RNA sequence: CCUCCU
RNA sequence: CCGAAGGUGGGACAGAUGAUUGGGGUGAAGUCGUAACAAGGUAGCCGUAUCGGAAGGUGCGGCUGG
RNA sequence: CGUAAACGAUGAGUGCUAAGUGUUAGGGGGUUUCCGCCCCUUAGUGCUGCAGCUAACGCAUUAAGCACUCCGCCUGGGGAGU
RNA sequence: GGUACCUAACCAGAAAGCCACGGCUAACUACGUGCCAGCAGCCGCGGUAAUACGUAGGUGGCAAGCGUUGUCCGGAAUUAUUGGGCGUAAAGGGCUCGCAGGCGGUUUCUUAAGUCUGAUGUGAAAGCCCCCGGCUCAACCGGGGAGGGUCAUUGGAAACUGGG
RNA sequence: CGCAUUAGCUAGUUGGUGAGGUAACGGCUCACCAAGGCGACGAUGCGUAGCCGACCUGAGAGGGUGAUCGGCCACACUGGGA
């Protein structure tokens, strides 16, 4: 359940789109990523598997991406739980961390406000 | 542009022939504006002028610019070339160029005045520090990122 | 009465054979100091069950008391869960 | 190593060894035990005075003492200084420096614990050879 | 087959 | 009654020391050969066995880092 | 008995990331009566070669690439696998 | 203890030092030795022209001392959680089967141990430190804070990890 | 805190019931019952050590120290008892 490597690998070879097995949180990550401007639309099909639809992330609609050099790292099975106070910022801004909360995500202000740091990405 | 040149090192190198050892000098020279531009330099295993000539080409070929938010770089970056590994980390005002030897030369002639820099492997490792300064230009200041993303500058930072 | 409560614990009953007595095992996940992984810790305890009601599997609550033996320090306040076989 | 591996078996530091082990052992007459005490010098009695050839690429007659310390450990130690400071079987104080040439000689005899000379009329830092400054 | 030491 | 010290006993453990003995390290210019590095003059090396002043040799199987 | 240069000197599992060409055992589908040719495809086994990686040599969908899980192992040379 | 401090002469008189100067790290020449005598933190100097040895004359730091030896941390991303590796540099177990352990597809519901979060109590004094004041500034003393907890107790949140 | 080149340890030991003792709870002591308790999350053994405020160092993580000064503990020629 690592979309990040799927993205990195396709992003490296400047692929137009990629089909990632869908899960609720992998759906909710792709939309966080889409907040910038990736994904145009997907095709929900008759469900046989729970993810056959995939995420269909299409960050390279044109020849070259305006949003290129996508990079992620902080995804270990050893759980890394952030304090609302001590949520990090990727590159001191210019990068986001998908901090899984009971009710919120994203910036440093969206930590002391929202609360549960939980997961931490880059 | 108005370049200043700095001599990093001059090592006597040698080829062996039937006669014996035949010596040349390989000079390594950093060159830069002191205002965002800086060049690698090689020295063609002969002299310093040969080094300067190649340096002044590499300033405009390689490091097209060194991004500079104030008197420091935009973000923290790890420059790696071979076993070169430089940490280049943005500092506060009045910090100084805290860096070691060859790294200092680059950052001084780049015009960076406030930076923290640790070397994690050492041997005229200017190529590694060059790759980081380019890696800043991947996400310079914030104008590109915002434009690349599809956002404003204050939207991106806060 | 406005009494400050003693430290209360809850866990599975690992021992019972000892009559008027049990061993309650408060399993928990302490973080390792350096490496930060949640390691499966387990503290055994010694509580008192006068009736001899508890058995293997019971996720009982226990509260601190006067020292009821050399090792015993708690009472069976209530059998919350009642596992069988 | 995996995190699980690092938990199961931690990291292990390198054991750094002292360059002067003989000055680290005290002694007790009563218990007849060495004690762990960080000494800067040790008194001893010279059991043998002589000369020894250095290793390559050097040649010399390097004057030394086999010395028996207060802690009961027998060391070899270099008699430093130009001119005959070699001395004979007698009490002496010792120091912690190796003679790179002489293999086994991990200690110097301190010049000034008794009758010494060393290099007389030293240029500067005139305190290394027991050179009493004349007036 | 061997080719003293620095 | 309990009971310190003491006595007796057979074990356990640790250090020191011991005729002699074993390899090890080190040491400007000792003796013997020349095993390895080139196809190193019988390609070398690995495991094992056996033999031989000594490097080593030979068998069997393996490897190419021939 | 329990060791080998027991070697790919490369732990196992999983996913992802250009191509080209042999070959082993299958499968499906072309017009065709088959044979045969052609296309596709699974699992092996080779060679060449992108990106990426590498101190370099080289590796490259049979990764030494990009990731995650778990195990084994390393920490200057000798002394000593004593 | 007729001791600190003041006045007032004799008067700047009484109050300069040690170490270092190949390179690291800003800092050289005569002579005497002749692989000797000696030097050496490391690299290394000396076999009859020694900028690193014996002597003789000559210079940057910190300031009655500074040299030498000993111990600890740093430099050492050199035991690497932060932050390293294992084709050939040291390093893949000869290969399986597997107990424990570690780790585990997707949805939904519920739970709330973990996770997060609010509030309350303590974590002396000194020391170091945030504002820092006072004592002429100091080589020093006071107050109000802060840190200090894998810490209680209690009320939430419930995405994620765990349980049904 | 170190050592698995220390893997089994324990027999008032583990719990009960009763009696006694104690300022006081209690195998704390004893009687009589059972058969427990501890341990790979390292018991047991061996080695080392007063612990803490702090101190030194370091970007920090960490590492080392615990003289002087403050707090808790322990001891008072060696050992036992009131
Ligand atoms: Mg030969
Ligand atoms: Mg041969
Ligand atoms: Mg034979
Ligand atoms: Mg083997
Ligand atoms: Mg084989
Ligand atoms: Mg092997
Ligand atoms: Mg298996
Ligand atoms: Mg370190
Ligand atoms: Mg090798
Ligand atoms: Mg190897
Ligand atoms: Mg293998
Ligand atoms: Mg003690």
Q: Map tokens 């599997």 to a residue.
A: C57
d(C-alpha A54, C-alpha A37), whole Å: 18
Resolution in A: 2.3
Whether residue A1 lies within 8 A of chain B, CB to CB, comes out as no
d(C-alpha C22, C-alpha C79), whole Å: 12
Query: Are D132 and D118 spatial neighbours (Cβ–Cβ below 8 Å)?
Result: no
Judged on CB neighbours under 10 Å (0-12, 13-18, 19+), D75 is buried
The answer to whether the C-beta of D55 is closer than 7 A to strand F is: yes
Q: Map tokens 């004690």 to a residue.
A: D35
Asked if the peptide bond before residue A56 counts as cis, ω within 30 degrees of 0, the response is no
From the centroid of its chain, how far is CA B35? 13
The answer to whether the C-beta of D54 is closer than 7 A to strand H is: yes
d(C-alpha D27, C-alpha D10), whole Å: 36
Chain A and chain C share a number of CB contacts under 8 A equal to 4
The A residues from 77 to 106 touching B (CB cutoff 8 Å) are 91-95
The enclosing H or E element of B4 equals strand B4-16
Looking at chain A, which residue has its C-alpha nearest residue B147? A66
d(C-alpha B119, C-alpha C54), whole Å: 64
Looking at chain A, which residue has its C-alpha nearest residue B141? A94
Whether residue D6 lies within 8 A of chain C, CB to CB, comes out as yes
d(C-alpha D95, C-alpha D106), whole Å: 9
Would you mind telling me the total number of residues written for chain B in this entry?
A: 158
Protein-to-nucleotide distance from the CA of D40 to the C1' of H19, whole angstroms:
21
d(C-alpha B90, C-alpha B83), whole Å: 22
Output the CA torsion sign for B4, B10, B16, B18: positive
Q: Which residues contact C2 (CB under 8 A, 6 or more apart)?
A: none
The nucleotides of chain F lying under 7 Å from a protein CB are 25-29
d(C-alpha B50, C-alpha B20), whole Å: 26
Protein-to-nucleotide distance from the CA of B118 to the C1' of H77, whole angstroms:
10
From ligand 3's centre to the CA of D117, what distance in Å?
A: 67
CA distance to partner chain C, nearest, from residue D13 (Å): 15
d(C-alpha C24, C-alpha C10), whole Å: 8
Query: Are D111 and D120 spatial neighbours (Cβ–Cβ below 8 Å)?
Result: no
The enclosing H or E element of D67 equals strand D62-69
Q: Count CB neighbours of D109 within 10 A.
A: 26
The answer to whether the C-beta of C23 is closer than 7 A to strand I is: yes
Q: Is B109 helix (H, G, I), strand (E, B) or coil?
A: helix
The tokens of B138 are what? 């991947």
Question: b/e string for C9-18 if b means 16 or more Cβ within 10 A?
Answer: bebbbeebee
Q: Which of B32, B26, B19, B74 is nearest to B50 (CA)?
A: B26
| Beta-bridge partner residues of C10 | C61
Query: Which phi and psi angles does A62 have, rounded to 5°?
Result: -90, 180
The nucleotides of chain G lying under 7 Å from a protein CB are 15-18, 51-52, 54-56, 65-76
d(C-alpha A47, C-alpha B13), whole Å: 70
DSSP character at residue C5: P
Query: Are B30 and B55 spatial neighbours (Cβ–Cβ below 8 Å)?
Result: yes
Q: Which residues contact D133 (CB under 8 A, 6 or more apart)?
A: D126
Calculate the dihedral angle through the C-alpha atoms of D107, D112, D116, D120, rounding to the nearest 10 degrees: 100
d(C-alpha A80, C-alpha A85), whole Å: 15
Question: Taking CB atoms and an 8 Å cutoff, what residues of chain D touch C34?
Answer: 6, 10
Output the DSSP codes for B32-87: E-SSS-EE----TTT-HHHHHHHHHHHHHHT-S----SSSS-SS-EEEEETTEEEE
> CA-CA distances (angstroms) from residue A78 to A2, A99, A119, C38, D3?
15, 15, 10, 8, 8
Judged on CB neighbours under 10 Å (0-12, 13-18, 19+), B63 is buried
d(C-alpha B83, C-alpha B120), whole Å: 9
From ligand 5's centre to the CA of D1, what distance in Å?
A: 29
Q: Is the Cβ pair B150, A37 closer than 8 Å?
A: yes
The tokens of B34 are what? 């002191």
Output the CA torsion sign for B63, B69, B70, B73: negative
Question: b/e string for B95-120 if b means 16 or more Cβ within 10 A?
Answer: eebebeebbbbbbbbbbbbbbbbebe
Query: Are B115 and B95 spatial neighbours (Cβ–Cβ below 8 Å)?
Result: yes
Query: Which phi and psi angles does B22 have, rounded to 5°?
Result: -115, 115
Output the CA torsion sign for B80, B130, B123, B103: negative
Looking at chain B, which residue has its C-alpha nearest residue A108? B158
CA distance to partner chain B, nearest, from residue A88 (Å): 13
How far from each other are the two terminal CA atoms of chain B, in whole angstroms? 35
Output the DSSP codes for D74-112: EEEEE--SSSS----SSEEEE-----SSSTT---BBPTT
| Alpha helix segments (H runs only) across chain B | 48-61, 102-110, 126-138, 143-149, 153-157
d(C-alpha B119, C-alpha D89), whole Å: 55
Q: Is C24 helix (H, G, I), strand (E, B) or coil?
A: strand
d(C-alpha B58, C-alpha D94), whole Å: 60
d(C-alpha B136, C-alpha B107), whole Å: 13
Query: Are A114 and A104 spatial neighbours (Cβ–Cβ below 8 Å)?
Result: yes
d(C-alpha C30, C-alpha C27), whole Å: 10
Q: Which of A62, A79, A67, A65 is nearest to A120 (CA)?
A: A79
Nearest nucleotide, C1' to the C-alpha of D59?
H35
The enclosing H or E element of C8 equals strand C8-15
CA distance to partner chain D, nearest, from residue C41 (Å): 13
The tokens of C79 are what? 């059998």
Q: Is A107 helix (H, G, I), strand (E, B) or coil?
A: coil
Half-sphere exposure of residue C1: CA atoms within 13 angstroms, side-chain side: 3
d(C-alpha C46, C-alpha C62), whole Å: 9
């Amino acid at each position: 359940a690592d979309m990040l490597t799927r993205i990195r690998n396709a992003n490296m070879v400047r692929h137009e789109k990629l089909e990632i097995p869908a899960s609720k949180l992998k759906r909710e990550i792709a939309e966080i990523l889409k907040r910038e401007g990736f994904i145009r639309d997907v095709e929900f099909v008759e469900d046989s598997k729970q993810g056959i639809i995939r995420v269909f992330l299409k960050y390279g609609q044109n020849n070259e991406r305006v949003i290129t050099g996508l990079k992620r790292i902080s995804k270990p099975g050893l759980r890394v739980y952030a304090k609302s106070n001590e949520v990090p910022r990727v590159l001191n801004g210019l990068g986001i961390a998908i901090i899984s909360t009971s009710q919120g995500v994203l910036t440093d202000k969206e930590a002391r406000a929202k609360q549960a740091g939980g997961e931490v990405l880059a | 542009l108005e370049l200043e040149e700095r001599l990093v090192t001059v090592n006597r190198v040698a080829k062996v022939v039937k006669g014996g050892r035949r010596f040349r000098f390989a000079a390594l020279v950093v060159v830069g504006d002191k205002n965002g531009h800086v060049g690698f330099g090689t020295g063609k295993a002969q002299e310093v002028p040969e080094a300067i000539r190649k340096a002044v080409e590499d300033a405009k070929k390689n490091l097209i610019e060194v991004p500079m938010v104030g008197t420091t770089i935009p973000h923290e970056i790890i420059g790696r070339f071979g076993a070169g590994n430089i940490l280049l980390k943005p500092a506060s005002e009045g910090t100084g160029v805290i860096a070691g030897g060859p790294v200092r030369a680059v950052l001084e002639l780049a015009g960076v005045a406030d930076i923290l820099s640790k070397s994690l492997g050492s041997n005229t490792p200017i190529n590694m520090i060059r790759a980081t300064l380019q890696g800043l230009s991947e996400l310079k200041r914030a104008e590109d990122v915002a434009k690349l993303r599809g956002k404003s500058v204050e939207e991106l930072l806060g | 009465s406005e009494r400050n409560q003693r430290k209360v614990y809850q866990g599975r009953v690992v021992s019972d054979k000892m009559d008027k007595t049990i061993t309650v095992v408060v399993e928990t996940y302490k973080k390792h100091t350096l490496y930060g992984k949640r390691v499966k810790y387990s503290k055994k305890f010694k509580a008192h069950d006068e009736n001899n009601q508890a058995k293997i599997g019971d996720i009982v609550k226990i509260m601190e008391t006067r020292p009821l033996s050399a090792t015993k320090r708690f009472r069976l306040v209530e059998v919350v869960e009642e596992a069988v076989i | 190593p995996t995190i699980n591996q690092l938990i199961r078996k931690g990291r292990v530091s390198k054991v750094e060894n002292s360059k002067s082990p003989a000055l680290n052992k005290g002694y007790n007459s009563f218990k007849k035990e060495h004690t762990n005490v960080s000494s800067p010098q040790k008194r001893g009695v010279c059991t043998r005075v002589g000369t020894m050839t250095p290793k390559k690429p050097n040649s010399a007659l390097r004057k030394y003492a086999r010395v028996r310390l207060t802690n009961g450990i027998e060391v070899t130690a270099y008699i430093p200084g130009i001119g005959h400071n070699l001395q004979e079987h007698s009490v002496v104080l010792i120091r912690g420096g190796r003679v790179k040439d002489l293999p086994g000689v991990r200690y110097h005899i301190v010049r000034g614990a008794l009758d010494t000379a060393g290099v007389e009329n030293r240029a500067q830092g005139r305190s290394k050879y027991g050179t009493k400054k004349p007036k």
